[PDB]
Write a protein that binds this ligand. Sequence first.
Ligand SMILES: CCS(=O)(=O)c1ccc(CC(=O)Nc2nc(-c3cccc(Cl)c3)c(C(=O)c3ccccc3Cl)s2)cc1
Lengths: 8, 245
Amino acid sequence: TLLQLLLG
Amino acid sequence: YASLTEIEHLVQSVCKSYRETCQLRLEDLLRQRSNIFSREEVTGYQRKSMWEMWERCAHHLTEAIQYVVEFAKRLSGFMELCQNDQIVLLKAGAMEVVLVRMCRAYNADNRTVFFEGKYGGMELFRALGCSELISSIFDFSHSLSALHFSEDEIALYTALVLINAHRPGLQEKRKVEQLQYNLELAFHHHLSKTHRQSILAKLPPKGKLRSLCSQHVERLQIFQHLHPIVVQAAFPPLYKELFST
Ligand SMILES: CCS(=O)(=O)c1ccc(CC(=O)Nc2nc(-c3cccc(Cl)c3)c(C(=O)c3ccccc3Cl)s2)cc1
């Protein structure tokens, strides 16, 4: 998910 | 078992996290209130294609969600949760937080909301073809503005909107419970000091925010079914992930 990437 | 000192420190930490990620300063939103869409501009919006209006909204919503993600990243205890819990909470809560935050951009005097650089009434959104959803959000924002939230009250409340131990799919359910409870103590303490505990029974009913978000997802389905190319090509990837069914 892109949320994972945004959370780092 | 957080002490009173620790609770007071949580109040300040939450309020600071919010202040740093609030997207638009309240002062600016207030000063922009005299800047309203002209009749020509309003007509232009109503004459816009459905795809263009949805695409604009998806972009603005995504922008607002990005500030909520940042709020979460700076929120005490959130980054200490496991990566799976972070996702579940944000996937379910990001839009709910945006909807609460949005009441800051709502002017109750003329029933307008700050959208694309000016203030405009709900007639601005006709071309979306979801007049009910729009009216429901406008009503919700009206309900909330009546509470006259301070920036600190928004901070604490939105923290609680996000940190919900009752979200399905949580791994560390008890760790989320503990964070939720401490944030509740922070909220209630802050309210008691400012003599504002009266607002607690005046906060949105337990399923209102759920309802608005479900409606949004549903109206997107009606749009997307009829315009599947545009969503694939031009809508923000994050938006699709959160809302596309
Ligand atoms: C929320 C953070 S802040 O208060 O700092 C801040 C920042 C930027 C803006 C500008 C903006 O982005 N303004 C929008 N306003 C609306 C909207 C639409 C209908 C009713 C209402 Cl009250 C608002 C939008 C939608 O795209 C939208 C579409 C469908 C359903 C739900 C929404 Cl919220 S974007 C406003 C507030």
